[PDB]
């Protein structure tokens, strides 16, 4: 009778409870208090209500989905995925998420506290899957939003180690969808071959989505995998912080990127990356411009630690027939990055910053400007010929480098013959320290190899801090590169023994608004006059020089060459020296040649 009610599922609803025997507290039943929390256990049962234990040969999907659906009906709450158990997912979800190869449909206000482990069963071997999907429709253009959905805890999402069946397939952990105020915190995503672990937003739709204190371990494992970017941030006001990214597979060194930032006001900070090809893409893709507009601005990549095999930060923008993408107002700072131990050319070209062409290779679609790269450290082993502070392979409308430390093969690089980027507002401040790891490795190479269509409104202030006499030059402009309204200086320190310092193969330094200084060795001859006496350069290629001054001591007693020189119409330098005793003098002097500076 009463016994029957008590042993029934309604029993706890008949056992009274008052918080700590407080007479002022609500008189409730045990069931009410138990109803304040909810776990997978409360839905992980057979049609008869008997609990099912999870494991290898149990598909937890439908039970988890029921839990999510039921809590969604009550306006939200948090479902615990209990510790001490692994909950295997063994089938595709149905309805709206079936188009996304979804396993589980996330729902608004329904949080998952994942304390235990979630593993994909062999069913998903060689198949595409997106484990959690916040889209409510197969077509995301027609999907509703996912709001206030947080996945967090000390738990694990394990992708079972299965390889991709085909390169064309997609795999994700959490596809939040058109996602507003959603986050993933504390979760370890491990043991997979996936396209992404997490995607935030959809073509700019979404806001305030974050990945914090998560771990991403060994999420590429096959040559089948076309591409990996662990977190793809595709909504504004969103980002990644204090995360850990690690790959061991050789394939990851060629295809894997830790983060992509694709919308405005997004960030990547305080994270550690190891074994990846790439740190981050920072890009406005025209195709993703619907939600938040055509401009990726306020892009922050800060205070990260990376060992990568390719490019740390890749800037881009591209266009569609109808929309043009723009990237501006980017800051890259405080990052300490190195190219991991590898053979030259054995992975994509090493670079701190890459200005990349779009996905179809186009290098004349880009609109990237107002980028500040500052207070970063970059290092590549001496052997890694393909390493650069910046690989500038596409049109650049501005990039500012200040107070960085770059210890790699090239400072500014682009391959000759390939793209011919149009370059505006490239600023390499003199405060960028050029490291010495690659000294004596630069035979035939130009430290700044300005392989561009044109350079305008740019500053290159070259400052060495050690000798490298192996390099062909500190900076070289091929005749094909136009240079105008630019400042190019090579500080004399450690350059005394250099044959070429700055090289302008088309004599571009003669430009009306080109401001240059660099050291050169010059032969001079004087008239025989006793007293104040002119010295002239034997060669006549200094028509562009506004002043020059000596960088050599004068070994002689009976005379001295001029300390300072100007030029003459015929291209000679001319200065006034002093013959204590008369006689024609002939000397070879190291000069700082200067034009308008």
């Amino acid at each position: 009778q009463f016994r029957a009610i008590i042993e029934s599922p309604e029993g706890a609803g008949h056992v009274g409870y008052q918080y700590r025997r407080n007479t002022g507290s609500t008189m409730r039943m045990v069931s009410d208090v138990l109803d304040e929390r909810v776990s997978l256990w409360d839905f992980h049962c057979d049609p008869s209500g008997n609990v099912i234990q999870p494991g290898p040969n149990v598909d937890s999907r439908q039970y988890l989905q029921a839990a999510i659906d039921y809590v969604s009906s009550n306006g939200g709450g948090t479902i615990t995925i209990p510790a001490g158990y692994t909950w295997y997912l063994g089938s595709y979800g149905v309805g709206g998420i079936a188009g996304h190869s979804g396993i589980i449909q996330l729902r608004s206000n329904v949080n998952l506290n994942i304390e235990g482990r979630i593993h994909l069963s062999p069913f998903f071997d060689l198949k595409p899957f997106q484990v959690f999907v916040g889209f409510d429709n197969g077509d995301p253009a027609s999907s509703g939003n996912l709001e206030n959905c947080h996945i967090y805890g000390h738990g694990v999402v394990d992708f079972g180690g299965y390889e991709f069946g085909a390169s064309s397939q997609l795999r994700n952990g959490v596809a939040f969808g058109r996602s507003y105020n959603c986050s993933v915190t504390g979760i370890t995503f491990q043991n997979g071959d996936v396209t992404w672990a997490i995607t935030l937003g959809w073509n700019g739709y979404g806001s305030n989505c974050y990945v914090r204190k998560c771990r991403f371990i060994n999420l590429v494992n096959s040559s089948v995998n076309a591409a990996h970017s662990t977190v793809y941030v595709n909504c504004p006001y969103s980002g990644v912080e204090s995360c850990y990214f690690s790959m061991s597979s050789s394939f990851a060194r060629n295809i894997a990127c830790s983060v992509e930032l694709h919308q405005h006001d997004t960030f990547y900070r305080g994270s550690t990356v190891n074994g990846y090809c790439r740190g981050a893409y920072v890009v406005m893709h025209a195709a993703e411009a619907a939600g938040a507009g055509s401009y990726a601005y306020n892009m922050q990549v800060e205070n990260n630690i990376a060992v990568i095999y390719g490019q740390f930060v890749i800037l881009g923008s591209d266009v569609t027939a109808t929309v043009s993408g723009h990237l501006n107002d980017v800051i890259v700072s405080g990052n300490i990055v190195s190219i991991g131990e590898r053979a030259a050319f054995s992975a994509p070209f090493g670079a701190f910053i890459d200005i990349g062409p779009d996905n179809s290779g186009a290098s004349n679609v880009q609109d990237i400007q107002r980028v500040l790269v500052t207070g970063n450290s970059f290092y590549a082993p001496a052997n890694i010929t393909d390493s650069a502070a910046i690989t500038l392979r596409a049109n650049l409308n501005g990039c500012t480098f200040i107070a960085n430390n770059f210890d790699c093969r090239y400072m500014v690089y682009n391959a000759p013959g390939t793209t011919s980027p149009v370059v505006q507002n490239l600023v390499w401040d003199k405060s960028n320290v050029i490291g010495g790891t690659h000294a004596n490795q630069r035979a035939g190479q130009n430290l700044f190899d300005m392989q561009f269509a044109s350079v305008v409104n740019s500053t290159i202030e070259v400052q060495l801090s050690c000798e490298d006499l192996s390099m062909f030059s500190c900076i070289l402009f091929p005749a094909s590169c136009q240079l105008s309204y630019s400042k190019i200086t090579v500080d004399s320190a450690w350059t005394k023994s250099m044959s070429n310092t700055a090289v302008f193969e088309g004599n571009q330094q003669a430009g009306a608004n080109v401001y240059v200084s660099y050291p050169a060795t010059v032969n001079l001859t004087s008239y025989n006059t006793q007293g104040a006496v002119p010295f002239f350069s034997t060669d006549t290629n200094y028509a562009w020089v506004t002043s020059a001054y000596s960088l050599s001591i004068n070994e002689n007693l009976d005379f001295s060459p001029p300390a300072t020189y100007t030029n003459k119409a015929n291209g000679q330098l001319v200065g006034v020296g002093y013959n204590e005793i008369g006689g024609v003098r002939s000397v070879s002097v190291r000069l700082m040649l200067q034009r308008q500076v």
Copy 2:
């Protein structure tokens, strides 16, 4: 009998429980285990103990207060504000918090896990309110402390959208009070017209208070609102990190500031701001000096992302009759900030740094020094005439700028006629990159417009990275500004066509300890002597010049002007050139004029 006990509120205290049937575990009753957690449900009942459902026409205040009071009595714990429900607050609290228009009194060690939503009912329309108040007295000087009180979860505090009834009113979300080890984490504060969302500490009393991962959305909405600063940090060793601040109302663009730091060892980092007038105030107010002293030092504003309409960081200090405020040891770094799209002068003057006068307008009370602004990016649209790296409107005892990128109308600015600040130790390192967005907009304007009473021990190293021939000058000192013991240089790059580079309207560059260099165009005439021959400037205003050198090529064959010049007592420049053939020469040359450098 037994049935009666079981169905009574004491029933759960009669049902035994042993954790997982472990014989080594404590033999308890269900009630004991249920007593480990506590929710608003346990106090949200009528006088008869029957639960009351929350909602529009239910005032949850007294029940929440009872819960807090009861848990406070047991030494603390955490009350859950359940998800899936909105709990409306409908009346003022009583006792100590009545003076603060408090709704709820917070108590020490009593945490609130806000998972559901908390909404203010229409009762508070046009009224002042402080939702949570940690003061235990109407007079904060006589208030006890709030300790170890943490508010956190995925929940929402909603201010109901009500406007201020009068500008004189105050509104707050969490007024922690004299607050030690208190924090707010994860909470969304939205939909209001408030003075602040959160205040930490009281006039320097308090420690270790933080706002982390919170969102602040649309918390100004009326022209009635006198002022808004979302988080006001008024105790040391406290700060804001990884928060999101957003306003849409036009009124916010004129009055709203995201953060104020008012005490030592405080920080604002990793946050995103949009639609605000101001990023942060960093200030020592004499009036708030009781708790932590008279010095705001160790002030950090780092790695934030902002779109604002006024000033990013505002430095200040002021005084009372008895106390003088001091601000020092501040760091502003890594921030990427822009002035949002607006008409010139349509909001408070755009500035990355503002040295502001105190609240009564005084500009001669300030003691601000040892500030480092570094590795920040600042951008304002070309149209925004009122935009500056620094608006220096009050006395400055030091500010150091290094390796920043500033792309706005002015670098250093102050309005003429207005304040006449006394300036010491302003350091604008040459590594600050000056952007080109405002090139061709600067007609009648001085890039560095040194409208001060005096400048001493200062460095301005002007380096352009593109042409702007529209500007009247790169730097101008009016005669009213004293200049001494300072270094002022204008790099020649992109300046060749400029009429004025550095302008000293009172000839201040002649000062004994003024160190300057800038380009000037100078007319010279030579004697007729064949051979080494002097050239002299026709004008006699170079009495201050220690050396000059050519920045022009020499078009002539038969002679060359001097490469380098010194001066003469009468103010002429004089150099020694060379007449291959005799004849009086007359030339106009671009020179780098130098004084003691």
Copy 3:
């Protein structure tokens, strides 16, 4: 009968429950739901299962250990240490942790949510203790791992204020051991005399361990304490963020360090330190190289706020007979640090960076290179003679300084006679601002006091921003220091009245590959020739000078000295000036002396 079962410990296992009366939910018993959580209460009982209340005269150790052991047996979970109670620990643990003076053995997957307080009883007075130990063996070489063990909450670990019994003793809060994915979050560690609060990893074994949002308050209190480092990070991919460290005891000012980073890819960020001797050690100890190798690389100390009494960041590496330690790829940025108010020499020598000798004092074992120090602020009161940007006391293979602000007594310092460090690749960029707080205090002192065995491949670009005529020199090299292949420049600004600017006591600036410029005052005499006329220096010590130029105005009408000078074999400077009227001229001029620059 039924009553008997219900009042028994099995009773809750007989009371049915179905989540919110949902017919689709699992039919369970109350006990099942209660079994989803676990607290110290469930094991804090006598042999008869009756609960024991915690407190002063109750030793909670065995009960907590039983709880941990039991949850470990079920594959993990989280034990709550309830709020509102203090749980005293009163004895040593047993077995594997007995060797580590362990109190509690941590176990994998078993998290502790510490909401209440944990206090050490008087038993531990004058004794060594490690409160939580994740080693499972007395010998860590033979210990298994601790994995997925997280300690977190709003609770407190209190060390009872007991002093060390002897300097030889060790004391720790959490010794995670060979620790993989373990963390401590939110916990206050207070009131002790300990060696550390937390240690992560063991000699490089471990990964992904973190200390976040923790507080460390007054953890040194006796002159007995040999040494303190609050968090010791001894496994890679691990770090400290957003923590608070505070000491009040005078002893802490001499022995206490906030953090040590001893393995690769480790970080210390966003933290506030007060009252400590030292901010961080960043070091590769040969002895700790077993787990993660011989290289500490990717070391990040960023965005911290410190008031310390000694050295902010101490770099080191040392060796064993068999292993050599290496430190490279370090970044120190964004930190705002000051030496607290103290008497000169009353604590270890104040320094932003210290290149320290190893523990046995050796200064010739170090291999430290590719360090970048950038965008930091450092300040020491004017009185603190012992304050330096860098104390360089041991061999340095590279350190790069850019865009810092240093306001202390020395920029570069080492005590004479003591160590004679060999120095390579020291780069002090011109963008480092030198503050004025110590102006007029530097009598007998060299701002850069290059007390080394040798300097090579180094850059010192000295830029003052105010006068200090008290200093003996801006930079001085004793004869014992070799200098080669280096650049040393002193900017002329604020140096006009200085007797010595750069001093080379062994004439090292004459080196073939030494590139220098600095101001000097020079006496010149001319020949009597009317017209172009040479001026020569009276002194003959400029054999090394490649060019010089005037930094003085010419007071005379009838002549002018040369604007620019070269030299002659005998060591004289020589230039060509102009005698309007003939006569031997004699002048004293301030020159910028230049060698190869």
